Motif scaffolding. Structure first.
Motif, short mmCIF file in Angstrom:
data_model
loop_
_atom_site.label_atom_id
_atom_site.label_comp_id
_atom_site.label_asym_id
_atom_site.label_seq_id
_atom_site.Cartn_x
_atom_site.Cartn_y
_atom_site.Cartn_z
N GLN A 2 0.82 -1.22 0.00
CA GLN A 2 0.00 0.00 0.00
C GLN A 2 0.86 1.27 0.00
N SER A 8 8.89 -4.06 -3.55
CA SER A 8 8.58 -5.43 -3.94
C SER A 8 9.46 -5.81 -5.13
N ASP A 9 10.73 -6.08 -4.83
CA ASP A 9 11.76 -6.33 -5.84
C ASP A 9 12.70 -7.43 -5.34
N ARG A 10 12.94 -8.43 -6.19
CA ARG A 10 13.74 -9.60 -5.82
C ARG A 10 15.24 -9.28 -5.69
N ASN C 144 10.19 -10.05 -11.13
CA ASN C 144 9.02 -9.70 -10.30
C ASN C 144 7.67 -10.12 -10.91
N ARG C 168 -10.38 -6.92 -0.61
CA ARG C 168 -9.00 -6.72 -1.08
C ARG C 168 -8.13 -7.97 -0.91
#
Lengths: 125, 197, 260
Positions: A2, A8-10, C144, C168
């Motif tokens: 949020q 959110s990255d490897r 990703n 959600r």
RNA sequence: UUGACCUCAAAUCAGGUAGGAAUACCCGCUGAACUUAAGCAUAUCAAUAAGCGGAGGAAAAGAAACCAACCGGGAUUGCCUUAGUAACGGCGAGUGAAGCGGCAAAAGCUCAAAUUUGAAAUCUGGCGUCUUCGACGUCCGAGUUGUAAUUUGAAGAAGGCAACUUUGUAGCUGGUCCUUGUCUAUGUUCCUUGGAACAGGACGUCAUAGAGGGUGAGAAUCCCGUGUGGCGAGGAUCCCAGUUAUUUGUAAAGUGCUUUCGACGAGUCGAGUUGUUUGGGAAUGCAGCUCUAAGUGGGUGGUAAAUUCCAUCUAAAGCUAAAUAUUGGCGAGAGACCGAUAGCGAACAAGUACAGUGAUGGAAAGAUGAAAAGAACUUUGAAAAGAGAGUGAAAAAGUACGUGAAAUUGUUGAAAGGGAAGGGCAUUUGAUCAGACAUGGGCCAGCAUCAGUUUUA
RNA sequence: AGGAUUGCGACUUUUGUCAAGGAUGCUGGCGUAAUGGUUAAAUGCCGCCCGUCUUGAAACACGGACCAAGGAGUCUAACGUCUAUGCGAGUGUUUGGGUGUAAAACCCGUACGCGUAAUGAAAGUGAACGUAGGUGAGGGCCCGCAAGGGUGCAUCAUCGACCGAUCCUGAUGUCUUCGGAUGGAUUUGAGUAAGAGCAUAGCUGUUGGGACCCGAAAGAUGGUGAACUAUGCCUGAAUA
RNA sequence: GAAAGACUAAUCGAACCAUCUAGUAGCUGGUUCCUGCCGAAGUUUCCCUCAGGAUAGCAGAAGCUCGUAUCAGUUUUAUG
RNA sequence: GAAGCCUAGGCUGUAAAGCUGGGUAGAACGGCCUCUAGUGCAGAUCUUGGUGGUAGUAGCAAAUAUUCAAAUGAGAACUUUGAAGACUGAAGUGGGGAAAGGUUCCACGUCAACAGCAGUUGGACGUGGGUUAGUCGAUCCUAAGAGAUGGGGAAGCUCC
RNA sequence: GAAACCACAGCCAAGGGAACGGGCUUGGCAGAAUCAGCGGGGAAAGAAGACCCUGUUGAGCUUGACUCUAGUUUGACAUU
RNA sequence: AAACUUUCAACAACGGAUCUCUUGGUUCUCGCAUCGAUGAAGAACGCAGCGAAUUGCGAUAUGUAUUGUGAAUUGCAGAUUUUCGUGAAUCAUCAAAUCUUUGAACGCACAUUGCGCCCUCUGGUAUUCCAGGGGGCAUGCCUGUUUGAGCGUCAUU
């Protein structure tokens, strides 16, 4: 997700893990408390330290329990005593275990380990 | 180099054009920066509108004289006509322009009505103590819009008098072409040579 | 990038010395001086027709053409043949054009929302979006895009009183407002007919957004599109009564083999 | 004989200040050719690359000596249009603006030229004292060849008559804006496979948390986090809000009427001529040289003049946020991008090893296993190693290490071989291989009478 | 070959029969390596080494010892014909504003581009005598039992009418030199005559761009070298 | 340069190093998977044109208006 | 037991290709409807990397020269000591320096590579040790030259 | 313990053929594996002919080729 | 008949393609404005119990003080007990200091660790010579201060 301040990255996630400073690895190398101790202090997990007392719950070593010798922060591990291999020449060598599997049983206490429990919101010493 | 039956194009790409190319990827992101900027300015200023109150103005040239448009500033004559000073008006949210002039009674009235409507509807807080706040209205253009003047009578009499509009244009245009030589032909014959007599 | 292949300075030896021509690196004393560069066939050379930023990415589309396709996708929400063909376990559900009461709009938590989908006629459709979850085949694994999973049901609504927050965290469920409502959610993968779950206020609003015969529209200069044919059933028309009564009889479908 | 003034010096005099670096973007000077014209010289590439000087987070520009010919607009900057248009050009190739119109953002102003002349009212430094980015007092100096107050063309001043509406400077707490630290849900229950469950099956739990990563194989529920909201600490402070001292005042500002005045930038404007540049065409701007003004004056009105009118601004001094740029720097997000001959030259001790006198040139090189548990002990050998043994799920994983293709080589097996081999059609022999006789206990031919096409007596 | 029947016929006293719109009947052996499939050798006949430029290559014409990976008509700004889609005398949301589950999806409208009028260098003027005109052909429909008559869109040919330029003609009037009525002409236009376009997307073709890939002898800007060698100067050394 | 167009760091009838530069080429060489249908040209006029382009001719594709038409690389009678 | 790889096994398609048995190996990958491209190689004196025939062949021939025993060592045509023969012949295969190199000098250990045969030897490899100045040099003076300052040029880098 | 070179390889005569074949056509013929020599062939290797012509590709030198130019010299105006 | 030559298969060589992986690249978006005579960027030479390189730092040399977290570091040693603490650590943080020789580089030079001058304290008998410890000496330009130069020029004996 949020908020916009998390990745959110490897590639960035793994880089933060492998090249972490020594102080930050204290928080990562943690272990859950047993069902007996969870009723006393009301905490599910803590950072694992030097002189403890621990039970192996998963892997080939499970069933055994012993005393922790040293927290190996460099290799992401914790050398527990009585968990060894006897080599062909007759020499004992410690075997390394990740502390997420391990379970704590009889917590070691100081001033700050008591105050750590008070900070989280847990009763007793 | 040429030859089927195609139109002759004009492509101006013989300089180093690839070094000086722009692609507007920022369109979507740059919109949010402006919406953030307009919002954050209103938070700083608080009870006042973001816009200054602008006057009504007529446009130039033959192409656009048939339409009205929001000008720059209110002039010094119109600000006086309502009943206030130019220096005071700048701090109340009224734009002033020292160089625009007035040669029209219709535009002169409209903008005096616009100032009186503005002065009545706004409130002013004193410098000292109490300040009874009343939210904020953002756009001054929303509350004070620009309307096109109506010079219309939908149903009307048909007063003919055998003049012919086409014949009026041909005579009027002929006068502009020939008034130069017709003045000089009158300055000879009747004058100069015959004033000597 | 640019400046990729151009960094080295090299020109060809040419004829006389028995090799090709095509630019070679200057004479130092390494294991590199003598090797080629620049050309597209060479090692560490230039890419043929190298990619640039100013290629056409986005595509403009007509406003009426979107609203034509979006309207036809909402027609595809009903009709059970197109829904079952496009996945979706909709065997249990009593009828379709499925409308729900406005008590759904004021749901707070997931525990309430999960119980609603069981009673209405779903949850098997959500359980599908759970067994589904598997790894990619290509190189999205390390870009990703590490897992796939299939689409679930859509929940359309008019007013917000905490409906989006509850649905959600449910695996397959998506949500959307009636005022918006685009082509992507209705017909994903260019296949018509998604299993929609309408609400009462959302379902009643559709005449006010698009329009009917007597009712206007609200969208600026828009009326719904009319079809070429009135009724899709052609087999009824050919048989009917008036058309078939006119003409001469048939010739027994298939003919004999003659001159064998 | 003594003391001033004006110009010019000296000092390791008291106190300050300038250089280099980086250069993606920004302000100027300087300045090519390859190329295109199917040749080539004006043109074009280009008012571009290289070279030189100077700035900042932005820079530049900016409050009309403007655009217009309308019922007139009204500082600058950018985007969409104007327009591939008006013009330019061996009128060939080719080049090429601006006004209005719709938007984003909008903010305005300061000197010189007048006498405080009933009081140089002004300012640097020295020495002293305080609440020290300063304030107060005192002593030399600067300066009347002009430092304050007062006024800037939108005006404005000096007098007379007339009503008055306004005011100001510190710190303290709180919010606000930054840098941060910590706290806040739910299974490691049973069975099969395995070296290892993070796999499969059965039964639950939490969800405003089923993003991502870690752990001996695909983990929401094992760990860190994520989501929702609390609670601290340390800066910035005038942006707001609420207070408390003060203590400004007889001084500062605004406005109605009427009379007299109303200062406005010179080797500049403007003209001729040379070279350069522009779409600017009897010459768009800039620069050198010669000539050199004016007071209802001067500039402009896109064809050179003379003559007469009209419309528009007020040059030759100066300051200023925002919308706009950014392959450099510091900090965060993403991708229908590449996957170790790719992607930056560089995933590794890479501008490194190495070459050149020197300017410069410039590589290759990622992966044992979950864990080194990295092979104790015997025996052959001068030793390296070998055979056994031992570790491990596997050593067909042994630090010449995941998988280990082809060229190319060794051994064993089968076949053929009188100046090459290697192919196509058709058999034979030798090898080897698919395919419905299983229920109760198809393959290969022969003769007879016919049909279609032929041949031979 | 085909795979219910339908047809033409023939012979029949008749039922029926048949060589008549494509093979049925009866019998034997084996039921697996026997028949077939691939593969290797032998025997008969036949077969020059590919790729390429060329009138012409096996060539005494050029490239090719062998293997692995890499390796060559791409993207863009203006465009032409054809095709699909949406609306249609109109069409185009996306410069910009409003919103948002946040580069998405959804909504909004002043302008502005092209189209709805042309022709002239320009000043300028600016498309119905008639059912928007006749003649020849014309699909389709209408009347008719037919022969034939009626009505005839698209389009093609053909002679006319209307608007602009060009060259004559020059009425009532009138600032006495303006004004242009009406009538004409082997001239002339990318015109009018019950409007067709605008937007998005696709193959093919065009022009600028590195422009399908590799390849010069050159030219220009700014820099580094006299440790080799050319020549002079200063200071040393060497020659039975 | 006591002259050979000699020498000037193995480079000289104009050195070497980077950049403009992927300089331009009417000239050479190469240009990556199968079957199916149709199937050429080396000729006319102009060009600082003759190893090259434009223009017509020949070829394919897309078709449109119609449905035995007023056609034929041919013969015959009449007539140039 | 996914991908990849090997196979004188099999089946389908005219073909581009696809499906499948046996072996090897140890973490991911397919079909059908659509979108999209840095999408298919035998040639380019193509680029980088690897390997052949040729071939155990060409060849390892200039500076006159070696021989006998003893020792060490697993091993001696080549190392160390003895004896005998030789050569350079003092414009030298002698004794010292300059430029240039930079530890190569010296001791103890020791032979995987290098010394185009060999190796117990080595300017190799591993670990240490070593250069002592009032008088010898540099420092100081000037040579052919170079080069600030005061000045004058140049838009300027800077030039005289 | 190498290198050059190498489509594939290595017996002749005549024919026809891009007009002088080691491979196509008709005859002669034809026996494992090999070692010294040798220079008849392999139009043997070396190098995208330097001679010759073409290109609307260049450079070095010369001159009453075409268009320019530093320097110098004459005159006018300024310094005056 | 063997050897030799050629084609195939199984095992073994040679070599590192294929397949799967990835703390690195590349593009796009968003935010912020901070080098230097108080001595920068760059350069040399040094420093660890055992380091050659890389990473850090300057004779206070893989760092010291200050603040936070609360027990490590780890290839092998070795401690220190600091382990209910004014405290382990190659931790994070960072506001006080140190900062060799240089470099715009500043006393004059610089193929030299070359050669001088001034003030000041301590030694050898010392205002002058020798050594040692500490502090200083560049150029242009501006504002002021103190000495001055010129019949350039004014008033007074």
């Amino acid at each position: 997700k949020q908020s916009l301040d998390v990745s959110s990255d490897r590639r960035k996630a793994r880089k933060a893990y492998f090249t972490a400073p020594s102080s930050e690895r204290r928080v990562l190398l943690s272990a859950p408390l047993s069902k007996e101790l969870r009723e006393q202090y009301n905490i599910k997990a803590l950072p694992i330290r030097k002189e403890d007392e621990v039970l192996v719950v998963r892997g080939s070593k499970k069933g055994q329990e012993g005393k922790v010798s040293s927290v190996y922060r460099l290799k992401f591990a914790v050398q527990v005593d009585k968990l060894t291999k006897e080599k062909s020449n007759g020499a004992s060598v410690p075997t390394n275990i990740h502390p997420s599997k391990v379970v704590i049983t009889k917590l070691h206490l100081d001033k700050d380990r008591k105050a750590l429990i008070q900070r989280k919101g847990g009763k007793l010493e | 180099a040429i030859s089927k039956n195609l139109p002759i194009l004009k492509n101006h790409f013989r300089k180093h054009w690839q070094e000086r190319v722009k692609v507007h990827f920022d369109q979507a992101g740059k919109k949010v920066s402006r919406r953030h900027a307009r919002a954050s300015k209103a938070a700083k200023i608080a009870p006042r509108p973001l816009d200054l109150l602008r006057p009504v103005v007529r446009a130039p040239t033959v192409k656009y004289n048939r339409k009205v448009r929001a000008g720059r500033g209110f002039t010094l004559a119109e600000i006086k006509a309502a009943g206030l000073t130019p220096a005071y008006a700048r701090t109340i949210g009224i734009a002033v322009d020292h160089r625009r002039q007035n040669r029209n009674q219709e535009i002169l009235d409209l903008n005096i009505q616009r100032l009186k409507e503005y002065q009545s509807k706004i409130i002013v807080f004193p410098r000292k103590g109490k300040a009874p706040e009343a939210e904020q209205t953002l756009s001054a253009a929303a509350s004070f819009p620009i309307v096109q003047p109506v010079t219309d009578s939908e149903t009307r009499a048909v007063e003919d008098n055998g003049e012919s509009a086409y014949r009026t244009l041909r005579l009027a245009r002929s006068d502009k072409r020939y008034k130069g030589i017709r003045e000089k032909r009158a300055k000879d014959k009747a004058e100069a040579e015959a004033e000597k007599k | 990038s640019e400046k990729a292949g151009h960094q080295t300075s090299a020109e060809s030896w040419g004829t006389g010395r028995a090799v090709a021509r095509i630019p070679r690196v200057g004479g130092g004393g390494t294991h590199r001086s003598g090797q080629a560069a620049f050309g597209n066939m060479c090692r560490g050379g230039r890419m043929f027709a190298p990619t640039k930023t100013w290629r056409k990415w986005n595509v403009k589309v007509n406003q009426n053409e979107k609203r034509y396709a979006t309207a036809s996708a909402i027609a595809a929400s009903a009709v059970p043949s197109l829904v079952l063909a496009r996945g979706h376990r909709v065997e249990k559900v009593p009828s379709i054009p499925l409308v729900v009461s406005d008590d759904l709009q004021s749901i707070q938590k997931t525990k309430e929302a999960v119980a609603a989908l069981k009673a209405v006629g779903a949850h098997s459709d959500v359980i599908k979006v759970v067994k589904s979850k598997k790894l990619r085949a290509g190189k999205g694994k390390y870009r990703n895009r590490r897992f796939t999973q299939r689409r679930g049901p859509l929940v359309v609504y008019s007013e917000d009183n905490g409906v989006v927050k509850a649905f959600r965290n449910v695996p397959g469920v998506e949500t959307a407002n009636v005022a918006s409502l685009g082509l992507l959610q209705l017909a994903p993968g260019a296949h018509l007919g998604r299993f929609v779950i309408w609400t009462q206020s959302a379902f009643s609003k559709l005449d006010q957004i698009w329009g009917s015969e007597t009712v206007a529209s609200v969208k600026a200069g828009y009326a719904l599109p009319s079809n070429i044919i009135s009724t899709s059933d052609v087999t009824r028309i050919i048989n009917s009564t008036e058309i078939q009564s006119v003409l001469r009889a048939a010739g027994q479908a298939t003919q004999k083999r003659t001159h064998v």
